Amino acid sequence: QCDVPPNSRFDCAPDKAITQEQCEARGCCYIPAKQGQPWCFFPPSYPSYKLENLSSSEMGYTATLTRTTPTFFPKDILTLRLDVMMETENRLHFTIKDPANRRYEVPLETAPSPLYSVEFSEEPFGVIVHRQLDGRVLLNTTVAPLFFADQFLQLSTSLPSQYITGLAEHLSPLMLSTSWTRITLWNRDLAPTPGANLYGSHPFYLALEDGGSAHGVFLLNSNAMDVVLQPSPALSWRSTGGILDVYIFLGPEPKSVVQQYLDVVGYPFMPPYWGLGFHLCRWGYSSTAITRQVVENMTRAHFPLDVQWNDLDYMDSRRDFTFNKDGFRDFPAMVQELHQGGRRYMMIVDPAISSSGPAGSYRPYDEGLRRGVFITNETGQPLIGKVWPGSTAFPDFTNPTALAWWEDMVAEFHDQVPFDGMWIDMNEPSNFIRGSEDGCPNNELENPPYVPGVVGGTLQAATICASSHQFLSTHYNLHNLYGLTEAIASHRALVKARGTRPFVISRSTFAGHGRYAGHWTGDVWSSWEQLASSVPEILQFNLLGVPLVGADVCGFLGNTSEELCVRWTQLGAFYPFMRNHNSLLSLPQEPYSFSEPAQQAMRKALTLRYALLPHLYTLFHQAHVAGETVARPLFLEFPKDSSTWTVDHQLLWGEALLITPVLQAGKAEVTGYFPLGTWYDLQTVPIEREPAIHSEGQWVTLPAPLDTINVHLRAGYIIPLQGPGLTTTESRQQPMALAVALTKGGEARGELFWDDGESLEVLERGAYTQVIFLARNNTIVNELVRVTSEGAGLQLQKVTVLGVATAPQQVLSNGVPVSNFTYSPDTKVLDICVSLLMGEQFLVSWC
Template identity: 45%
Template sequence: MYDPSQKRFEVPLSIDAPGVAAEDANYDVQFSSDSSHFQVKRKSTGTVLWDSPLVDLFFSNQYLQITTAVPSTSVYGFGEQEHVSFKHNMDFVTYGMFSRDQPPTPLANLYGVHPFYMCVEDDSNAHGVLLLNSNAQDVSLSPNPSLTFRTIGGILDFYVFLGPTPENVIQQYTEAIGRPHMPAYWSLGFHLSRWGYASLDVLKNTAKRMHHYDIPFDVQHFDIDYMDHRLDFTYDKTNYAGLPEYIKELKTAGMHSVIILDPFISKDEEPGTYRPYDLGQEMGVWINNSDGVTPAIGKSLPPGYSVFPDYTNPRTVEWWTQLCLEFKDVLDYDGIWIDMNEPSNDLTGQLPGCAANDINDPPYIPSITDHSLAQKTLCPDSRTYLGEHYNTHSLFGWSQTAPTFHVVQQATGKRAFVLSRSTFVGSGKHAGHWLGDNKSQWKDMHYSIIGMLEFNLFGIPFVGADICGFSSNTTYELCLRWMQLGSFYPFSRNHNAEGNAAQDPAVFGAEFAKIARATLRIRYSLLPYLYTLFFESHVHGNTVVRSLMHEFTSDQQTHGIDTAFLWGPAFMVAPVLQEATRSVDVYFPEATWFDYYTGRKIPSTWHKTYATVYAPLNKIPLFIRGGHILPEQAPASTTTKSRLNPFGLIIALDEHGEASGSLFWDDGDSIDTIENENYFLAKYTFSAGHLKTEILKNGYRGADSLKYNKITILGLKLRPHAVAVNGGAVRRDAFSYELNGKLVLGISAPLTHELNLAIY
């Protein structure tokens, strides 16, 4: 057992939840008459959401366990692992959660920890459950169906989110843990990166061929190659001579730069020559050995041995802030990519090894890789500001993220871009995430959709995978299909590892570049829609990418679909995920759907069934859902340029001839534009042949010079005889109508004036 007088570790995350009187709650908590188990029930339906037999409750010092029945097998979430399906297999599967530098492998615990799941009940209501616990843990899924949670420390701190829709669940969850941050507009452009640019010249030549083929390209990342001997806050003045000037060149061209920083600091440089270590020693910022005094010493990328900053310590935040601000004067970066922050360590524990005790070798080790708490990281009895590493290990990346976010905003004076490999509950408030060191394999491309859907459940919607794969060499066709899919990741970056062949979309020649350019131009044209989804995520907690199940919950067929996905409620992406394939079987839930490319309505005979859709090598199938209005903008080679271009609206009508949508717009990178009301927000409604625009906020003067120049309407039942915009007739040669019901209208109207359109 345990000593109840000893305070147990609790995650230092403030959970914000509105207080509700018991009689107003939409749930009941009931104990059985013999007190053998307790239940949480949904009041409106009587569905039992949580049912724990107390005989299965264990509560000892280093082992806590609780089991609950769940109301259906439609269970999603838990992370971070590589899952082979979005809807979980409940056939006695166990997932471990303990942050680890581990390339994606089925059933292995990966970089982050998210003990959160969503369950869709048999009547299509949904609920979510969070176990707020940072200790090493696992969860077993059983076909009863039931879940068994086990953790080796902390407390059993559960939060239940009643929905009842999947979107409501995530809105409630992010209200509790922190809303996702609002990304800078430029960060929604295409990012290019690799570990293995041997010199600045190699990197420059890569960028040149991107520009040669006019492939949209906003952000250049700099991996550890740019560093001097892989030392943070340095750059290689031989192989990367001229780097500060080049970063300024990129900025002048309207592009942006992201630098990588790793969380270990070399201790073996000549005394007095490496300021990050000297200053850290002086300020006492390291994770210490179990004595709480001497720094824990491990080994990683830099030469010699390294020490590890303790970001839970306020002094470390001061140290990190000072160094990041100073480095901004050396390299004029726009964002910071924080990698290997599990934290990763090449040793098993630190020098000279981990002592034999119950903290380093607990009585129960959850189902994690190597069944070791010290493998590839520090000893659990190391000391941090908040206590033992045993409790805080999985919080390392999370604790590094907020200080990095704040210093990037301070350094740039703009909205922060922070990309973190290790994440925890609430990380989305300050960072985006990529899915780690995937492989150049077709299955990894499929799994990336699953990971992207899951991180939207976790409140980290700014997510993507390394396009074309990180490790091993890609192939022409795999990379081409992955570029098509990756063009629709919220975070779209092509990145790969040292020693592998270059895989940027310009390296494969003119035909590949032409296809990649065309697909990225679709992304760029729809960025106003994607940006509006991020606004709704930041303000209301919505998902940005969601599964078909999310929108069509009552359709049981959608519960297992993870080969296609939606941007918001309205835009379906159905990528090719198999080699040598020139068609895709797409499931169309009951709704009006239109082919993005032609505007043709999908036949009603395809509804609620799989239809084979032609997908030649140069095309990724894309569909728009009726009932929605998508804002668009003419694309360009960068968002700096595209943001100046005219806007359009795609109005996709439902079976009643109606549609609605909205557009959020601001300057794209100032801090707190929403909170300061420095933005433009329009709501569009189409009904009975009329488009009405309501301007909800007109607080951004930069929108005054922008115009609408194109309206596309899909699903018109009758050929229009006349069209009027803002009371004035539109010339017949300014619009075209196709027999499939598509009307394309050329106009010129100010964005910030209410746009009213009538079709007769």
């Protein structure tokens, strides 16, 4: 009974240090590891639940689960109900609940055969899910006992391979280590560092299968949890409350798994076009005069800038919905002037509301108190913590009245200063003291029987009391949703205040965040290590349906170097959300603050991003309508090439653009993986060294001097480009161009989505233009999917064709010789001047 292979041992003492005698007294096996692997582990006979009265419904199945021997945790729920729902051909859903008591549940909005088959083990109870096509076991919960106690849930499964991604937010490779890794989900204000619970929690994984198929698993549970990965390979979910609410997504393609997951949690929100421009912020722009000089200095040096930001500097004594009458006396005028120049404005908003001001002197607190918007303690008074303004209360964003109060505070402040979005920081929620000014009571929520591996060893560390009261439940159950609930409140407040698409960037997140807001990776150091770590983290958030993500360009903490800032701006120009942000005590890192050569390299990176904005916007449209990723790992695009599975220091934009950054000091080259096919050097496309890599699926060393980032265009793709501007207000008025990357057979395809860039309900109202581009047999045509006033007058003035083997003797536009074209025999590039409209059918041809 104790003969269990080391890698297959499941921990029977996850709760405490245990002796051999105590371990054997639990009915467990004690075998020291020979050098982590648990010494105390479950025999195959350890008591679990027994399946009884399995029954069939039109939805799927129902059963009773009965435990007859208690576990070592208090308050086992001895009788459970199993519900299995065969929802779609690619989505299986099952729940395990207490049929005698409603338990906390996360609030969530709602040949012919399924891709899965399901069977059950009777005793010990397990759910077994096969992929029907090849018989592969994806889920098998029989591998370890089911635990279901009031404050401890444990469900385990075999994994189909050593390759698993997800379970944000942690500083990790994209593929998680299965070598006895404990991953803790408990939203926490901590500067990103490995092995720590960070700002967000996403209880979703995507698991690769030999051959390139994949499945995903979502545990819809917002409690503090540990996820334990072991090398058998296997996974254990360990949650401190709620229920087991499990979704399995059958793929089979990794991109399909992500789309199926986003079908449940929500497709990403469509950002405004201006949100894809460059953002510039620091902590320390201490006046409107200084903030105006940033825009002036960027403009003078020809650096594009769409959005100027301020941190805490604008506030009166670090209070929300105020501005100081010293440095920021003319704040409204500053923001109005930004709008006059075609730029937008963003500023920080914290959740905590100053509670110490004289009564009647600070409306956000006074009105919050009147309407009962705050998280309360045992006696029903507001829980008071300590943040930037001093003593503060914390809004309860599960309370419908708090949502109305937040809408009013945002709308009233927007009447004073017309800001264009909200930067919501510290929404873990972050507390500078432990729990509250009055400490926390001694109860089972504050001191639970199982404490997951959180930094500081307590649920109260850097946050508010776990037993504090919210409208829907205790903070214990709702903590991991706090940031998400603020993002939802802020999204609605901005819609009501401005009547156009909201732009919310949030530190703390939960599963489904991307439906409402974007994210930045928080207080990263200005280091080569953190530049390199940003690529896996940006890819991970794209898999989790938060495509609007980035890191602080040049890093937040510490002082950047000029070389690091060049490399970080080059890579950061490919973050879907691109902001340079800087800490209070740091040396300046605005693009105009560097040497002339560094400025040139940073200007080129920004110029290329701005040229690509129509393409990036189209990629966001595909995320919003079809649950696609914007920035994606090579394995999402080439899953059948197992060499891609561990690549996380390269990224794709969509299907076609491969970015291979330098991520180390002193390098003038980079080695990157090129999947099978032809990859054209984007340097061969004119914008205002081998021309093509012919890959069999291999590593290629590329020249990468300080002024260069490697970007390659996949053969068979067409990308729309637009002319330059210092803002998207300017760039959106410029003529467009196509980059047409031909296959060997002369084929290529691409698309453009265009709307007014900011209106609500565009797709519902049909207020957009959608065009497909097709290259075939020495011709390029457009196919008009939808043409409306928004996009009709888009000018196409240049067509660049890559992979043209022989110089043409004639180039025609709608049957007439073009005014001008150039062919380069060295690079095989045909560059064509044209006078066309995206919204009217054209035919360009050469021979």
